[PDB]
């Protein structure tokens, strides 16, 4: 349907998959990384009804489905379900055949090896894609943001990777990776709202809480002052409409959940928080690198859309940083949608045509080729 | 010798072309039944010989 064998770009995370073609500005479609399955016995006959549902089908029919995510903390653990998600992504909504297009997939630099290897195998064996590449999330964010140097703090649904990059090169000894993510904030919000009389323990309830989080929650610039008021007055509560007509209001819980990014102890995690790890990613780099990383804190990934987060991340690191020097945050309206955007940019670069793995080299090496050719 | 190389290549390609046709035929057969099931979904409530004996008896 395209006038060129443009690469397909699929930003497959632990949240939603954003997909479209290289050279465009935006994904053609977005899909929950979900395969749904009925938890009930059918009663009426000739009702259609699938054994399993994919993406938005799984979410739309969720009233009686248990919903599973094949990707956890950035890694595919269930590749049969990813084959279904990709079939849907490519043939039902983008309506393209990867057999005629190179495909670009994304991951964090320390994502366990099985992820990129199984992603490579699925696209070469079930879709028979002519070429593959698995790209770095930080690289993709840097292209989207217009930078070659900076800290990419990618606090999304799966993991926070936090990798410093200078002149387009990794500074791997300074990756302050953290097992704290948007999915934990969602789990925390389900629990804290349960305490308000609105229990959220089932799949339908979990999807509702994620929707509540995305629309009602924030981190603010000053937690203690924000809570001093939110805990004292109803003036800071915000309502939300649930699908069945219930109305829930959230007070200080509205920010106490999200605050776990700065205070991980709220969910039992042992961590300094995302702002200290951002600071250390800069500090652990050489002294002639530090000045450029301080001036370029690059925000990407999920959770970047919480009110007060860009302002707060700059405040928290500038407060740890030395005086005289200027410390700055980069947080464009392209935040979180930067990995997909970077995929489009990267896939299309003329210099990247030497990075793509072809369905030639693949057959001689097998999927393990991804560890020889990508990064 | 060129012809032998050409016939060998053409049948390799031919197999894939025939397989591609087969795949689209298969999709039509599958789509057709889904449509038939949906047709039954709305036609079913009236597929009866009705209201004759009601007056005859």
């Amino acid at each position: 349907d395209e006038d060129e064998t443009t690469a397909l770009v699929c930003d497959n995370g632990s949240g939603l998959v954003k997909a479209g073609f290289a050279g465009d500005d935006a994904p053609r479609a977005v899909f929950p990384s979900i395969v749904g399955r009925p938890r009930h016995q059918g009663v009426m006959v000739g009702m259609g009804q699938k054994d399993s549902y994919v993406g938005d089908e799984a979410q739309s029919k969720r009233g009686i489905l248990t919903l599973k995510y094949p990707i956890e903390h950035g890694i595919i653990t269930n590749w049969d379900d990813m084959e279904k998600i990709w079939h849907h992504t490519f043939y039902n909504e983008l309506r393209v055949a990867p057999e005629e297009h190179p495909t670009l997939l994304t991951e964090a630099p320390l994502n366990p090896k099985a992820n990129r290897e199984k992603m490579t195998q699925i696209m070469f064996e079930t879709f028979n894609v002519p070429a593959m590449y698995v790209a770095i999330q930080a690289v993709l964010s840097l292209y989207a943001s217009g930078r070659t140097t900076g800290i990419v703090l990618d606090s999304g649904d799966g993991v926070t990777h936090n990798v410093p990059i200078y002149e387009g090169y990794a500074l791997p000894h300074a990756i302050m990776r953290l097992d704290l993510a948007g999915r934990d904030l969602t789990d925390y919000l389900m629990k804290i709202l349960t305490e308000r009389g609105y229990s959220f323990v089932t799949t339908a309830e979990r999807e509702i809480v994620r929707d509540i989080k995305e629309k009602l929650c924030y981190v603010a610039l000053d937690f203690e002052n924000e809570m001093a008021t939110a805990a004292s007055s109803s003036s800071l509560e915000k309502s939300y409409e649930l699908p069945d007509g219930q109305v829930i209001t959230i007070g200080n819980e509205r920010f106490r959940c999200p605050e776990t990014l700065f205070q991980p102890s709220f969910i039992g995690m042992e961590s300094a928080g995302i702002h200290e790890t951002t600071y250390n990613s800069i500090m652990k780099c050489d002294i002639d690198i530090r000045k450029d990383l301080y001036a370029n804190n690059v925000m990407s990934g999920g959770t970047t859309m919480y009110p007060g987060i860009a302002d707060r991340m700059q405040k928290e690191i500038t407060a740890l940083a030395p005086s005289t020097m200027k410390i700055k945050i980069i947080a464009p309206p392209e935040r979180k949608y930067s990995v997909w955007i970077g995929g489009s940019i990267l896939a299309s670069l003329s210099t990247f045509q030497q990075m793509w793995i072809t369905k030639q080299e693949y057959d001689e090496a097998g999927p393990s080729i991804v560890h020889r050719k990508c990064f | 010798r060129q012809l032998h190389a050409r016939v060998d290549k053409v049948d390799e390609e031919r197999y894939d072309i025939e397989a591609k046709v087969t795949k689209n035929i298969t999709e039509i057969a599958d789509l057709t039944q889904k449509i038939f099931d949906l047709r039954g979904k709305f036609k079913r409530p009236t597929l009866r010989r009705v209201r004759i004996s009601a007056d005859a008896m």
Partner: peptide, 14 residues
């Protein structure tokens, strides 16, 4: 001290 592609590859070649 004491693959789906292999199947299709074979079909077209056979």
């Amino acid at each position: 001290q004491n693959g789906k592609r292999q199947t299709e590859r074979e079909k077209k070649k056979k």
